[PDB]
Amino acid sequence: DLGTENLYFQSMMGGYILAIDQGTTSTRAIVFDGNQKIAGVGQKEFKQHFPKSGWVEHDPEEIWQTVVSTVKEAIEKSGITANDIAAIGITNQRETVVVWDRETGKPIHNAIVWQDRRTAAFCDKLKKKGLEKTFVKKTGLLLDPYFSGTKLNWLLSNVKGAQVRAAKGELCFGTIDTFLIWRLTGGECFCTDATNASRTLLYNIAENAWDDELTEVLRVPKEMLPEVKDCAADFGVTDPSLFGAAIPILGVAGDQQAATIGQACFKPGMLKSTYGTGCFALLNTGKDMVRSKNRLLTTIAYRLDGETTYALEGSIFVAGAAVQWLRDGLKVITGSLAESADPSQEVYLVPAFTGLGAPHWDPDARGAIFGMTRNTGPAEFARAALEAVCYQTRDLLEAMHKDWRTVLRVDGGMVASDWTMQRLSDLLDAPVDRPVILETTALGVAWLAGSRAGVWPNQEAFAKSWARDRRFEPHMDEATRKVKLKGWRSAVKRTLIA
Amino acid sequence: GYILAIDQGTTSTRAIVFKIAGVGQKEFKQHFPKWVEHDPEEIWQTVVSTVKEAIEKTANDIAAIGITNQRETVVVWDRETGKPIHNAIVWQDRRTAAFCDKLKKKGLEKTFVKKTGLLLDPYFSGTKLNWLLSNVKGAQVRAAKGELCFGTIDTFLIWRLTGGECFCTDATNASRTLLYNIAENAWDDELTEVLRVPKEMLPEVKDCAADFGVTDGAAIPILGVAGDQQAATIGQACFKLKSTYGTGCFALLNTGKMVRSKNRLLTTIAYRLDGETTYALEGSIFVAGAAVQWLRDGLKVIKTGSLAESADPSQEVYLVPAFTGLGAPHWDPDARGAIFGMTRNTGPAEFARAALEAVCYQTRDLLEAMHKDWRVDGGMVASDWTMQRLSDLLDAPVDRPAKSWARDRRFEPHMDEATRKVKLKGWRSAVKRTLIA
Ligand code: NA
């Protein structure tokens, strides 16, 4: 062919997999090649809406556009076409609720984010009425505003027309995964996975089914609820208009469970912790649903060909969001800065901005800084912020120890920081494993899709393939350690007390 | 006129050869190792640079000179010379807390409280002197011969001024020593010996109007000696309660001829004129305007007055700036700085506010101890905001610069009753978290 005589072109590669990671504060799309390597990434923020202190909302059209654009972006940066994608995986910030019209797909309201605290009062009504018991028992969760069920009650009760249209069978409820699936397939598929369903307060974690009593209690019509599947299942096929190709959606799991999968935490006792705006630690607990006595959540780690693997989770609401406060709020300014702090000074930050999660579950606790001195500056605030990440992880793990009887795996952008992870090993007095790919949440769901599509290896292969970048080891003087640990316990008490 | 003036602050030393005819300042290093400390020399040099740079802006135009000082601040130096054995341990310093608690444990606190009008607390000089002698290498062996001079800043400053000729205190500064009987006006044998403080070390306690020697290009007689906080009152036509606002905040209410306090306050000497000693009740706050300095210098998030107005009114942010413990009326030397209530939203405006507000809250806490036992100046009392906010919060009027005493402004509460109870509850809540065990 004239003139391809001296013309160079690259062909193909095979086994490409697209993971969409619809996060709290941005959306990412990653293409993984047939070697499970990252080929191309799109990333894009969307607006955080705060209509009142403690209230948090996303525009779901904006989240939608962010998925469309981020996808196109990763594919182009990958040097391929949408037609080269064997399959898609979806993960998502959990608990976040969207309600939308089953016919037009128009949401009736902004998405109410997992961070949102607006139903505190309604959760108190239910608690006083003797109700937390069945929820805890059925669900593994608590009657806190964190979960979906309470937020969905709020939309049905406060958006005009909502309760009515819902009862007619005209509205769809979804966590963010269901919202994406619905839109990717152009309305064809109305579904979630067991892990996202776990998080709603509506689902029975033992029966693997929407729970009649809980839905009745919250006055949610069973109709509005999507079908619940395994994490690797058939979630439909991409609407061909969106990317110019029909791609099967084959992997879906909540972001913290996707990271759990991506860190190969498949066996009982294995544990991971993801560091983002919040921090979320999950312990693989095997076939058994461990009921915590130490203020942890019981949840579904994943459900795989009909089989549910369970987990214990600690959920820290403010982790990275603290340094984000330092940098954008106070603008007082990060491990670089933090290593420069005066050791003589003892400053603690308890970032209880709108309450405290595990293991405290104190929705009335507020932000507090301690131990300031006439000289304390940015450096020490910055240290207090990163150390608060450490100390809260610690308290999660100590609670896990009391619930269960094996080296901490760690991911999220925050951990590329050698100073922070070293400081983490120290305070834990335990070793810390940091992987080669930190985007563990994307890979976990990319694996689930890959493995079902058959272009990627099975569970045990993927598991032994887990690649360590770095084991951190504790190298802090014990005396020093005692001092740091005692100062934090005293910061905590001062923050929790009436 | 023509009287010289030396305001030996904690951060700086200001001068006024006063109408006014002198005005100069030079700042010095707050060496804070764990604790607070000044360089004794940097003081002697700064004082002798603040004199020759306030009188040029001759050597014999001043008839006398007048010394006021940061109180309680201790220095040990030699008799036959005057060499500082250690740094000035400063009134701010918390180091001797444990030693005080050893003393409270042996049951000594009541004899001190009774003879002294103060408390077993790191704030005052006696325990700092004790720390000197046990901690400096064989310094008591020095002191035990008479080779050491104790004395507060007035004495360090009246010493070197008179070329080692005069070694005196006044009775106000003497109240602050925790070694002095405030009724009998003497160094107490039991107090000093409990402290193992050899009386040879100690200076002659003179009057506020007395003959404290000739200076070193003139031969001028030191004839004025009280504490900045007592001479605050005598600057403040209160000879019959003033509140000073600089780095700390200090308030004293004239008691007339000894109110053995019931509300964690101080029994001190407002003055002693010709032997006839007038006492006041004291409320004393370690950090006030230093809280805003910290913002600008420590954290450097502010570049107070206007910003405090800019602050989101949905935000309940509070600051108990216990950088070095809390004075009146908590007397917790183990308390540290704490900030409460931060949100994603909290920015430089809300800290600034909380820090200006802090002085108002702490003020209030003193008067409520005063209006239970029984008018403000200072540099940081300039902004109308702060004073208005102070009148609002105290729910009481406040006045800002002999009937010869002149006013500028009296202040009035343009604040709602429930908004005040809201802002009051937050403080008290902030205070309780900072103080609990
Ligand atoms: Na290629």
Swiss-Prot record, chain B:
One of its GO terms (cellular component) is cytosol. Its EC number is 2.7.1.30. The keyword Transferase applies. GO terms for molecular function: ATP binding; glycerol kinase activity. Sn-glycerol 3-phosphate binds at T10, R71, E72, Y123, D228. Pfam families: FGGY_C (PF02782), FGGY_N (PF00370). Keywords: ATP-binding, Glycerol metabolism, Kinase, Nucleotide-binding, Plasmid, Transferase. ADP binds at T10, R14, T247, G289, G379. Glycerol binds at R71, E72, Y123, D228, Q229. Inhibited by fructose 1,6-bisphosphate (FBP). Coiled coil: none annotated. It catalyses: glycerol + ATP = sn-glycerol 3-phosphate + ADP + H(+). The keyword Protein biosynthesis does not apply. GO terms for biological process: glycerol catabolic process; glycerol metabolic process; glycerol-3-phosphate metabolic process. InterPro entries: ATPase_NBD, Carb_kinase_FGGY, Carb_kinase_FGGY_CS, FGGY_C, FGGY_N, Glycerol_kin. ATP binds at T10, T11, S12, T247, G289, Q293, G379. Disulfide bonds: none annotated. Pathway: Polyol metabolism; glycerol degradation via glycerol kinase pathway; sn-glycerol 3-phosphate from glycerol: step 1/1. Key enzyme in the regulation of glycerol uptake and metabolism. Catalyzes the phosphorylation of glycerol to yield sn-glycerol 3-phosphate. Belongs to the FGGY kinase family. This is Glycerol kinase. It comes from Rhizobium meliloti (strain 1021). The gene is glpK.
